[PDB]
Amino acid sequence: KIIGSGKHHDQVSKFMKKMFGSIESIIFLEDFITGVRSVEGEVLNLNEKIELKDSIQAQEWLNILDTEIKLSVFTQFRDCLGQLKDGTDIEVVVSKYIFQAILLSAQVMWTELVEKCLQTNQFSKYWKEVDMKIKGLLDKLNKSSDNVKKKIEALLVEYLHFNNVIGQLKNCSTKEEARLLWAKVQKFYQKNDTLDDLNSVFISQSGYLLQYKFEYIGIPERLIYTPLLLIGFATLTDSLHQKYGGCFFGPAGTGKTETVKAFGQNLGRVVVVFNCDDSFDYQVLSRLLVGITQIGAWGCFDEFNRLDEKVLSAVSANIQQIQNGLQVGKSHITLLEEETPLSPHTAVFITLNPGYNGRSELPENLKKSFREFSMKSPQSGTIAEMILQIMGFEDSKSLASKIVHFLELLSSKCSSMNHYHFGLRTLKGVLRNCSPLISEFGEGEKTVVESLKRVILPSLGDTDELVFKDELSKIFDSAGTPLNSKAIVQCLKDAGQRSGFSMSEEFLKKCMQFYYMQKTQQALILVGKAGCGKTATWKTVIDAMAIFDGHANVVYVIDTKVLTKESLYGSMLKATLEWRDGLFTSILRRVNDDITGTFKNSRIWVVFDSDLDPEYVEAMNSVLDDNKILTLPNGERLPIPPNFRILFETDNLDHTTPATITRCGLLWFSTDVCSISSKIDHLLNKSYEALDNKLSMFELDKLKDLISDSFDMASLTNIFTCSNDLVHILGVRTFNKLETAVQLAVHLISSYRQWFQNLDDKSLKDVITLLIKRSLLYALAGDSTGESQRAFIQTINTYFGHDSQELSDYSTIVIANDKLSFSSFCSEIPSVSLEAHEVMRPDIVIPTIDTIKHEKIFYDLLNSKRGIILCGPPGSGKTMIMNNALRNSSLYDVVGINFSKDTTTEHILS
Amino acid sequence: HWFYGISIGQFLSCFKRVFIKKSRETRAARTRVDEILWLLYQEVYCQFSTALDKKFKMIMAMTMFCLYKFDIESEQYKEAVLTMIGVLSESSDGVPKLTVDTNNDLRYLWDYVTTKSYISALNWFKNEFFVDEWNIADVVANSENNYFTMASERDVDGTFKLIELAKASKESLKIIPLGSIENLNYAQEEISKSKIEGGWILLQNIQMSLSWVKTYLHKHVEETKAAEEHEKFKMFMTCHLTGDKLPAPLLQRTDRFVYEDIPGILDTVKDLWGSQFFTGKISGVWSVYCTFLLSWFHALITARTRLVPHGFSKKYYFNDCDFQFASVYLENVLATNSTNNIPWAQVRDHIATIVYGGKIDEEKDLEVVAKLCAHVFCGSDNLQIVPGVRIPQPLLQQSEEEERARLTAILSNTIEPADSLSSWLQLPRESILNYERLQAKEVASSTEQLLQE
Ligand SMILES: Nc1ncnc2c1ncn2[C@@H]1O[C@H](COP(=O)(O)OP(=O)(O)OP(=O)(O)O)[C@@H](O)[C@H]1O
Ligand SMILES: Nc1ncnc2c1ncn2[C@@H]1O[C@H](COP(=O)(O)OP(=O)(O)O)[C@@H](O)[C@H]1O
Ligand SMILES: [Mg+2]
Numbered sequence A: 001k002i003i004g005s006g007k008h009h010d011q012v013s014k015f016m017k018k019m020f021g022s023i024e025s026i027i028f029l030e031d032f033i034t035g036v037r038s039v040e041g042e043v044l045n046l047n048e049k050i051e052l053k054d055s056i057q058a059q060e061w062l063n064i065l066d067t068e069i070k071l072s073v074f075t076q077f078r079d080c081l082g083q084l085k086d087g088t089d090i091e092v093v094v095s096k097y098i099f100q101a102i103l104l105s106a107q108v109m110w111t112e113l114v115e116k117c118l119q120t121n122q123f124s125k126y127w128k129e130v131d132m133k134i135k136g137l138l139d140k141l142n143k144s145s146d147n148v149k150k151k152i153e154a155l156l157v158e159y160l161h162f163n164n165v166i167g168q169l170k171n172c173s174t175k176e177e178a179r180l181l182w183a184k185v186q187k188f189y190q191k192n193d194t195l196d197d198l199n200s201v202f203i204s205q206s207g208y209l210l211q212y213k214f215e216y217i218g219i220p221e222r223l224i225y226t227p228l229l230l231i232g233f234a235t236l237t238d239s240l241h242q243k244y245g246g247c248f249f250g251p252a253g254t255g256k257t258e259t260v261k262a263f264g265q266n267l268g269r270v271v272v273v274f275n276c277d278d279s280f281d282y283q284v285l286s287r288l289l290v291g292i293t294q295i296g297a298w299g300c301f302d303e304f305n306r307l308d309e310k311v312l313s314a315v316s317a318n319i320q321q322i323q324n325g326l327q328v329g330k331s332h333i334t335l336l337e338e339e340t341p342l343s344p345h346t347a348v349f350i351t352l353n354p355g356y357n358g359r360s361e362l363p364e365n366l367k368k369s370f371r372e373f374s375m376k377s378p379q380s381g382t383i384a385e386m387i388l389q390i391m392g393f394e395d396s397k398s399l400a401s402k403i404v405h406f407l408e409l410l411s412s413k414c415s416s417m418n419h420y421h422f423g424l425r426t427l428k429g430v431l432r433n434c435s436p437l438i439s440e441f442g443e444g445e446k447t448v449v450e451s452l453k454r455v456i457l458p459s460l461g462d463t464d465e466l467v468f469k470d471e472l473s474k475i476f477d478s479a480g481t482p483l484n485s486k487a488i489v490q491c492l493k494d495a496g497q498r499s500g501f502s503m504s505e506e507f508l509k510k511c512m513q514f515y516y517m518q519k520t521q522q523a524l525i526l527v528g529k530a531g532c533g534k535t536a537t538w539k540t541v542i543d544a545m546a547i548f549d550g551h552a553n554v555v556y557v558i559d560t561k562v563l564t565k566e567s568l569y570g571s572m573l574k575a576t577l578e579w580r581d582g583l584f585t586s587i588l589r590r591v592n593d594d595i596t597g598t599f600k601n602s603r604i605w606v607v608f609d610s611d612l613d614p615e616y617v618e619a620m621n622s623v624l625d626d627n628k629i630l631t632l633p634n635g636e637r638l639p640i641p642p643n644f645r646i647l648f649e650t651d652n653l654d655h656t657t658p659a660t661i662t663r664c665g666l667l668w669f670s671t672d673v674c675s676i677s678s679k680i681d682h683l684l685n686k687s688y689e690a691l692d693n694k695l696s697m698f699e700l701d702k703l704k705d706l707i708s709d710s711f712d713m714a715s716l717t718n719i720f721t722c723s724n725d726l727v728h729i730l731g732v733r734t735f736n737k738l739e740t741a742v743q744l745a746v747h748l749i750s751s752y753r754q755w756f757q758n759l760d761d762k763s764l765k766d767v768i769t770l771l772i773k774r775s776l777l778y779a780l781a782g783d784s785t786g787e788s789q790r791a792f793i794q795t796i797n798t799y800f801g802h803d804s805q806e807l808s809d810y811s812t813i814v815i816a817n818d819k820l821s822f823s824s825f826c827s828e829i830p831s832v833s834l835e836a837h838e839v840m841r842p843d844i845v846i847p848t849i850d851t852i853k854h855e856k857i858f859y860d861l862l863n864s865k866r867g868i869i870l871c872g873p874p875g876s877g878k879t880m881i882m883n884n885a886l887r888n889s890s891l892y893d894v895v896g897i898n899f900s901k902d903t904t905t906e907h908i909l910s
Numbered sequence B: 001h002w003f004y005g006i007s008i009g010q011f012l013s014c015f016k017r018v019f020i021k022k023s024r025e026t027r028a029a030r031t032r033v034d035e036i037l038w039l040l041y042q043e044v045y046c047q048f049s050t051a052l053d054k055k056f057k058m059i060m061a062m063t064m065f066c067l068y069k070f071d072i073e074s075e076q077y078k079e080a081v082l083t084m085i086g087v088l089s090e091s092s093d094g095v096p097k098l099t100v101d102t103n104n105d106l107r108y109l110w111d112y113v114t115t116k117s118y119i120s121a122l123n124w125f126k127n128e129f130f131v132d133e134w135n136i137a138d139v140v141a142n143s144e145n146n147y148f149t150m151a152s153e154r155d156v157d158g159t160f161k162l163i164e165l166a167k168a169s170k171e172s173l174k175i176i177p178l179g180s181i182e183n184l185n186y187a188q189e190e191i192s193k194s195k196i197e198g199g200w201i202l203l204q205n206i207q208m209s210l211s212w213v214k215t216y217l218h219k220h221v222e223e224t225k226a227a228e229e230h231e232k233f234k235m236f237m238t239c240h241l242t243g244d245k246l247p248a249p250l251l252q253r254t255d256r257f258v259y260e261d262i263p264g265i266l267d268t269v270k271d272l273w274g275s276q277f278f279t280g281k282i283s284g285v286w287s288v289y290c291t292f293l294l295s296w297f298h299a300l301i302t303a304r305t306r307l308v309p310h311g312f313s314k315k316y317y318f319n320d321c322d323f324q325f326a327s328v329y330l331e332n333v334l335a336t337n338s339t340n341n342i343p344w345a346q347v348r349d350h351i352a353t354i355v356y357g358g359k360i361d362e363e364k365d366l367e368v369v370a371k372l373c374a375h376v377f378c379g380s381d382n383l384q385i386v387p388g389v390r391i392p393q394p395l396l397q398q399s400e401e402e403e404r405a406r407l408t409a410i411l412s413n414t415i416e417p418a419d420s421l422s423s424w425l426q427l428p429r430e431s432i433l434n435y436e437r438l439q440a441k442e443v444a445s446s447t448e449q450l451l452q453e
Helices: A012-020 A058-085 A090-094 A099-120 A123-142 A147-169 A176-183 A229-242 A256-266 A282-295 A309-328 A379-391 A397-415 A424-434 A445-459 A462-475 A486-497 A505-520 A534-549 A582-590 A658-663 A678-693 A699-708 A715-721 A734-750 A759-778 A787-799 A851-863 A877-889 A905-909 B008-020 B032-048 B054-072 B073-087 B104-114 B119-127 B138-142 B161-166 B179-195 B207-223 B248-254 B265-281 B286-306 B321-334 B344-355 B363-377 B400-412 B431-450
Strands: A023-028 A032-038 A187-190 A201-205 A208-211 A243-251 A274-275 A300-304 A333-335 A338-340 A347-352 A371-376 A523-528 A552-558 A602-608 A645-649 A664-666 B147-150 B201-203 B235-238 B255-256
Touching: A012 A023, A032 A058, A058 A090, A058 A099, A090 A099, A090 A147, A090 A274, A099 A123, A099 A147, A099 A176, A099 A187, A099 A645, A123 A147, A147 A176, A147 A379, A176 A229, A176 B344, A201 A229, A208 A229, A229 A243, A229 A256, A229 A371, A229 B321, A229 B344, A243 A256, A256 A300, A256 A347, A274 A282, A282 A300, A282 A309, A282 A333, A282 A338, A309 A333, A309 A347, A309 B207, A379 A397, A379 A424, A397 A424, A397 A445, A397 A462, A424 A445, A424 A658, A445 A505, A486 A505, A486 A534, A505 A523, A505 A534, A505 A664, A505 B207, A523 A534, A523 A658, A534 A552, A534 A602, A534 A645, A582 A602, A678 A699, A678 A715, A678 A734, A699 A734, A699 A759, A715 A734, A715 A759, A715 A787, A734 A759, A734 A851, A759 A787, A759 A851, A851 A877, B008 B032, B032 B054, B054 B073, B054 B119, B054 B431, B073 B104, B073 B431, B104 B119, B119 B431, B138 B161, B138 B255, B179 B201, B179 B207, B179 B235, B207 B248, B265 B286, B265 B400, B286 B321, B286 B344, B286 B363, B286 B400, B321 B344, B344 B363
Parallel strands: A243 A347, A243 A371, A274 A300, A300 A347, A523 A645, A523 A664, A552 A602, A602 A645, B147 B235, B147 B255, B201 B235
Antiparallel strands: A023 A032, A187 A201, A201 A208, A333 A338
16 A cells, blocks of 8 residues: 555555554645654654655655654754753743653753762752752643643653652762662763764663664653662663563563563663464564564563464564574574564563463573563552652652551451452552542642542441541541532432432432542442442432533443343454444444534443443453543444443442452442331332322322321331241342332222222221231242241231231232122132043142132232242142133233243343 | 373383393392392382482382382281371371381381481382482493483583583583574484484473474484484483473383482582683683672572472572673673772672562562572671681782682582581571471372372
């Protein structure tokens, strides 16, 4: 395509990202090349414009541009260093030069100044000067544009490294210790008396020298400088001095590849990263290796420990060839069945992840040419202080020490739990949530306290909350208060009492915690046993925010485990080469692509309302991370807008990885949000509003008054406590049987509304009480043996009043159209006779008292519009009783599905 | 283990040798059948123990002694030794049924085991075979094969032993290291011409070229049965027990044995110090002194690596690459800096963390390396690395050759005490006793499991 693009010369800019790795486009002029621009967005202006005639090949002018960009970077560096040397503020020079040039000029000037400072041992003055520079950069960051903000942040990272080193040098007691510390720190120098400008600047660490190749790097994600990072740099430069390659091994997520890339950036190189175990072809890798050898770039094998055995052997042979050529000093090595030149600036790095067997090591042929090093997670305190210094926090050292001490204290005192993770990741999450809170309250200790209470506190259990509170009081001297209280609390109360929910202290506490957590977090997890109120909590908060802000809400409730990964994320027809959307990506595209609907002024919620497993979430881990992009296995890479928020409603995290818990805002429901006599009232109101559409006014008011005052929690609390004494098959706690009790009671009451108008008040109350007793018995003790059912009947007749009509084992309201009395009866015992030829049909049943009672209760449960579960030993008669109850009626048709050891979800649909 | 494979043909040849070997008239075992059975046991242990490492050598010796004495001796001996192995293993405990004046050698074994001298107790069974273990001289001379595999761990290489043998065995050992495709082609040409010229050839570190051996060497050695009809040449292979699994037919075709010879600390110091000046001096006197100290430190760290988990939690193989990198750093720091000793403080922190502490992934082992470096390098005009030697700092005239001679003399003057692993190294003697008890427990458990099976 490039070869055929020798006339327009504008199709190369698409592949500039691939062939340069750092620059995304070439900024053109009407017939000249006026510069380049990187992926982050930054105009590098070439000093000498490149003419482009039509006859010139793409190869020739690309070749001249390759040197021109490096010469331009060196020119920017030299101009910036000459400017800063004639003392001028960093703020006025940030706007002129690219990030790399100002970075290198700052590093060289810092090294030059601190050398003489170490000679004279007067560190306080330069430390204060650097601190003032950092404060100036910090205040200029607030007034920065979209492009300059990244550059300012990177310069802040490097300047805080400078100040850290100067402070450590100042604290050193002896000159020997100061020089020991200065040896490890990566120093920068330039030779003022040399030709070949591109080789003027070099880097000295531990006495080893490395040339600075001036390849443009852009404005990359700078890593925070920590004493464990500089040890990685020292190991890499020690390996590179002796021409050995560079191997890192350690736990995943310790930034091995990022450390290699940061080392390359400091040296001015862009590191070509070969990603492994991504169905990575070998031939393309061999081509990349030949390119690395011929150019001289640094190639890093990311996750090298995961490769096919034959592919691993082939690539290890190639790497050994390259390394042998480098060590010997020979040129024109033999690989790819070809002799190719080998530039002596080539280098190979490898990063090995821990496998299933534990530790992973290099192949045998590479162990004699690679110097392995073990990477570890950084110390919490050092980078805690560094991040607090990234923000405008005062007393950042004391704050970081207090935060780390509080976290360790919590880990030592709080009760052990699966999701209790107080490592470095929790610290970084606390700081990231503390970052946006700076707008509301300043950069004091109370901001950290509020972030801790908004991150750690919700995820803690009930017994550990008091520990959190008292340790927070006794560690942090000041305990703050939250703002924006009255308005959102009143709005939550409105949105809850509108839906019937009871605004208890616990429910309001959980709603407030969820609201504050979703204020900043994007991925939410709600954990708690079935019936705690996760759905009620988040729905109430959604309604409250809709009423408060005025933004509309769009909710997509998806059950993850019902749908396979192909349906949830997207399926590709490998035999026909079409990609299908799936469910999650379809509703993401409907958000990004469409604008006619209310999608910019509305908050999108995707509630994964099912148990989560690592396999499902690993396909969206990029969404959970700071990337905030959904990376499909093939297709467009979808950006999630700020309104798009993912919630996870589950009941356990026994299979969710620590990474997902740390990234996602976790809200743990340690107890039910409402008491028994609040769920009962909510269900009563939800049934009254359903009956309201098919009933008169006064009759309904009187009936609901009778239902409400007929039972009281004083008598029912003893019943609910006694129900736990009974043995329950397929046990479910009574807080979940309340729904069945209330719904069945209300339906039974409503089914006899015709016989209530001409009914006396006393008999009406007796009817309501008897039906309530029946519903309570068949909901609480409905899954008992049958003798324990009689025991529960005695309990019911004891704890209710002694005047209401007693409930017997067969007490049923039978109503005759010729009489007005309720006429409650029991124990009919009918009789039936059948012929010989009817002895076995799938619909012949001998009616006994047990059969009639079971059929009656089953039909009453069906008419209550609630699902039923008949649990019993084989041959007991569950199917027979259903089919008899539904054969008599002309309203229901039975569809019998027979589940087996594995009935897929499409069996039911079929 | 993938290396201890045994075939019916080898066993039958070993049994044939029982009759073939009309050796010295052994103990008078009455009937000829008993004497033949004893000779069979002796020959099996003498031949098939070379292919095993030290722990499995002990296991074989104990198990075959038990198998022989469960038939030759009485029940008062059988239950005695069964309970004896139960005592040696830490799984069971009790007193054996010691019959006085009837089982004397068992009483010597009881004296050994009560004194908690596990190594002598385990070597008692080897001593009871009254046979001298075959060295590589015996194996190479006696076995009528042209192929031998020399396995070992990654800490010790027996290439020097094979060189010394073949220089004294009829001609020209020829080392052919593997590696890149150049090494592979050079090796194939060398073997193709050496099977005709007859010189002994050696193939260092087969493992790295596994894919090559699976394709070239395997079918070659399986098909070159006319090599015995070629000139009398011997092709050797060096592997690693912890390395990758060699193909089964290739290993079965060739003879095998395990090189188990760990040199003493002083021996390693002497070897390293001798080898350092063979390549010639690089810098002045202080470079020589620092190279001597580095040799001492490398020997100490390698010796402590052997112990596990004593000294170090894992067997971190500190090869010669670490020594080369540390030597390069020492030359650099003594070149850029001055003659004075001031930068010792940064000689440690680089050696203890970057070159020798890079492989380390646990904090305890890093602390071990750091304290070892602090002990070895921090010195003021008189350094006592081990309680038996004192190293004075260089002279004032700075005569480098005299300094090298003096260091050689101070190496030759001292001798290694038998308790060096507790005195020369910093870990206590009770640690060594616990280590030995653990290894004896492993041996006893394995042999009991085998006997029960
Ligand atoms: N504040 C409240 N006052 C009264 N009743 C409430 C309150 N909150 C919840 N409930 C009752 O508790 C029920 C819990 O329903 P919800 O769907 O929220 O449960 P959950 O714990 O998330 O469980 P699931 O795993 O079944 O989704 C509600 O349907 C309602 O009947
Ligand atoms: N009252 C009854 N009248 C007639 N048959 C009964 C009665 N009680 C139990 N049975 C017998 O019990 C068996 C239960 O069958 P089925 O309903 O298939 O078991 P399940 O309900 O466990 O699937 C029936 O075959 C029926 O013949
Ligand atoms: Mg729910």
